[PDB]
């Protein structure tokens, strides 16, 4: 049995998202849906096609007729930018439970968020292992999509940078970080390290000191 | 009333690993257990279908042949043998009550095959607002907690096979992983 969901869905705040999920005679069968916020685990938030669980907003609903059943978000908010899946449940078929693809709702026209940045030098305990790691911390930033250029004093650098994906966080807005491996050779000789956090064509200041 | 899956962790390619999943709250023999799983970042995916206090078994045709599922009603705990475990079962695996209520959903446990050696992970002070830096670990379950005598963490990356993270406060370190639980203090 195959269950189709639009990969990605994406709403204006307030506006409402209808995420479909089609089968073959669909609503002869019973429908669940599961919502995912990216790091936690799947929530229900409709099952038994129309019926909502406890503690979930009246504005999730659910329909299920004919070759497609719907989650209809009224007033969609940030908070519930998230993965969705439809799950079908079926006691006959040698596959009783049959997930979807699933669907992304991305939530448009978020207010954007200055980087919040925390260069780190590598530890007095690191340099004795004859290691050198430079961290980049990113916080509370939207959109996800930031530029770690790695300088050191006025010359910029290439190897030993490895910057992660941003992740999204509680608040809706994404974290990201960014590791610079170096020699402990290379720490003592330069007189100063730098992360340029470029987000949104507006970089960021970042500076440590070798000395102390 | 609720589920708590276990017996996760780092495998090698081919090998197996046993899943548990306690239950607790309801009457564990009467109603059919489920596994399901998740790639990281895909979409879900039913892995087997134990049938009540009964015995009836279907089964994802990705583990066909290969993953065992039992159930245990006396001691109301529910099991999932693997077998030749690959990249296409490195997943979270979750242990759902398929019922009349609403299904329960217990937490699932993450199981990674891999191709390098199972490591520790390695703990060292950051300070400038100060931090906690946990590197050189596999597999990806790091976990920080703050708690000092007198708050988010940020996601790891991939260096030279082995993964890192780290963290900071607002204004002593303590992380959990399977290898080994770490503690480092910060001025």
């Known amino acids: 049995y195959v269950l189709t969901q639009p990969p990605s869905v994406s709403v204006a705040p307030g506006k409402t998202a209808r995420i479909s999920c089609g089968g073959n005679?669909?609503?002869?069968?019973?429908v669940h849906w599961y919502q995912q916020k990216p790091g936690q685990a799947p929530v229900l938030v409709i099952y038994?096609?129309?019926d909502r669980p406890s503690g979930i907003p009246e504005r999730f609903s659910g329909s299920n007729s004919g070759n497609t059943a719907t989650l209809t978000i009224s007033r969609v908010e940030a908070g519930d930018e998230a993965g969705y899946y439809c799950?079908?449940?079926?006691?006959?078929?040698?596959?009783?439970?049959?997930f979807g693809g699933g669907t992304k709702l991305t939530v448009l026209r978020q207010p954007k968020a200055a980087p919040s940045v925390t260069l780190f030098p590598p530890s007095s305990e690191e340099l004795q292992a004859n290691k050198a790691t430079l961290v980049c911390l990113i916080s509370d930033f939207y959109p996800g999509a930031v530029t770690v250029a790695w300088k050191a004093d006025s010359s910029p650098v290439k190897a030993g940078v490895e910057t992660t994906t941003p992740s999204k966080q509680s608040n809706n807005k994404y974290a990201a970080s960014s590791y610079l491996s170096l020699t402990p050779e290379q720490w003592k000789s330069h007189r100063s390290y730098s992360c340029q956090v470029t987000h949104e064509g507006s970089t960021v200041e970042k500076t440590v000191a070798p000395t102390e | 009333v609720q589920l708590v899956e276990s017996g996760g962790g780092l495998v090698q390619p081919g090998g197996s690993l046993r899943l548990s999943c306690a239950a607790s709250?309801?009457?564990?023999?009467?109603?059919?257990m489920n596994w399901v799983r998740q790639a990281p970042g895909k979409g879900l995916q039913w892995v087997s279908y134990?049938?009540?206090?009964?015995?009836?078994?279907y089964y994802a045709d990705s583990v066909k042949g290969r993953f065992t599922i039992s159930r245990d009603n006396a001691k109301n705990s529910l099991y999932l043998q693997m077998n030749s475990l690959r990249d296409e079962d490195t997943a979270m695996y979750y242990c759902?009550?398929?019922?009349?209520?609403?299904?329960?959903w217990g937490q699932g446990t993450t199981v990674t095959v891999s191709s390098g050696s199972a490591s520790a992970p390695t703990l060292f002070p950051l300070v400038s607002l100060v931090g906690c830096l946990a590197q050189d670990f596999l597999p990806d379950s790091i976990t920080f907690s703050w708690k000092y005598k007198n708050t988010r963490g940020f996601p790891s990356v991939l260096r030279g096979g082995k993964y890192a993270a780290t963290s900071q406060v607002l204004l002593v370190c303590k992380v959990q992983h399977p290898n080994g639980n770490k503690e480092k203090n910060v001025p």
């Open positions: 759902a009550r398929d019922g009349v209520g609403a299904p329960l």
């Open positions: 709250g309801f009457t564990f023999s009467d109603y059919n």
């Open positions: 134990i049938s009540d206090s009964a015995s009836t078994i």
């Open positions: 005679n669909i609503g002869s069968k019973s």
């Open positions: 038994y096609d129309t």
């Open positions: 799950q079908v449940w079926d006691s006959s078929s040698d596959h009783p439970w049959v």
